[PDB]
């Protein structure tokens with residue numbers, strides 16, 4: 001990671017605030033994601049043939065939103081421990097790779113997330129850029145690991 | 152959960168303090184777990200020929216230790232949403248079941264954890280009991296789901 005101290009601090013500081021509100025706004029993020037990206041929704045076989053109102057309230061969606069938040073937290077906490085960061089992200093990668101999810105889906109989700117998070121918290125463009133750069137490190141690890149793995 | 156509000160609150164409060172020390176103390180917990188239960192150590196194949204000093208400082212242990220506290224956090228966060236808790240714990244169960252880990256190994260880890268946490272934070276027996284009951288909720292879901300998975 002070539003993330004600077006100020007970049008990592010902006011992300012960590014932003015995330016510290018965001019994570020408390022995620023418990024309530026996270027499901028709405030995933031609905032937004034699913035509405036933009038029906039192919040993303042389609043990986044959640046539990047949601048087959050379900051109205052988006054029902055998806056939004058589903059414990060399965062809420063669990064994934066918690067899984068998302070916790071994953072992101074684990075990465076942000078490890079930005080100064082690159083070997084640990086890579087192990088954590090590779091474990092995420094394997095699980096999603098096994099479901100036929102390409103890195104491109106993470107890139108979609110990350111791009112939407114940064115905007116969603118900025119709109120919520122109204123943090124500055126410095127902080128938005130720092131998020132984008134941080135999530136590009138994460139996507140870089142995901143993508144490279146998916147290329148290592150046998151389908 | 153027959154978990155009371157007071158029980159859930161005691162766990163959430165003690166966790167809020169412990170969580171923050173887990174970077175400092177989590178590796179030592181797993182060393183103690185490995186020394187107490189050699190069979191638990193043996194699930195971590197990358198540690199077989201390693202000195203325990205090497206294990207303690209390894210990125211792989213540190214990653215599992217982070218995974219452990221995040222998983223526990225996710226459960227504690229969800230004590231008021233039992234359908235969500237069950238899903239989160241079922242996901243854990245699948246992954247570890249596939250590695251041939253029985254629920255008994257989680258029972259051993261959980262009991263050691265509550266002792267370790269109490270020794271560190273010096274909370275009262277009410278709080279220790281609330282941890283034990285909370286982790287029994289979790290273990291019950293794990294055990295049940297392993298029966299399903301077969």
Ligand code: HEM
Nearest residue numbers: 040043044060067068071072095096099101105106109242
């Ligand atoms: C940072 C982004 C993400 C994080 C941290 C994350 C985290 C997780 C976690 C921890 C799990 C449970 C463990 C497992 O089976 O893998 C999970 C499950 C899942 N994830 Fe993600 N995920 C992310 C993005 C996505 C995306 C972009 C998709 C789809 C394109 C997706 C689809 C799924 C599915 C379908 C499951 C299985 C859900 C279930 O069985 O209930 N995830 N995710």
Ligand code: HEM
Nearest residue numbers: 091092095191194195218219222223246250252256257260
């Ligand atoms: C609350 C208790 C625990 C939690 C939350 C937890 C969580 C995790 C998580 C999230 C992973 C990565 C799963 C993945 O994405 O593939 C993992 C891996 C693993 N866990 Fe656990 N775990 C716990 C207890 C245990 C126990 C008791 C053992 C052994 C008895 C164990 C052995 C392993 C092993 C061997 C791996 C694979 C590690 C590797 O080589 O990369 N876990 N654990």
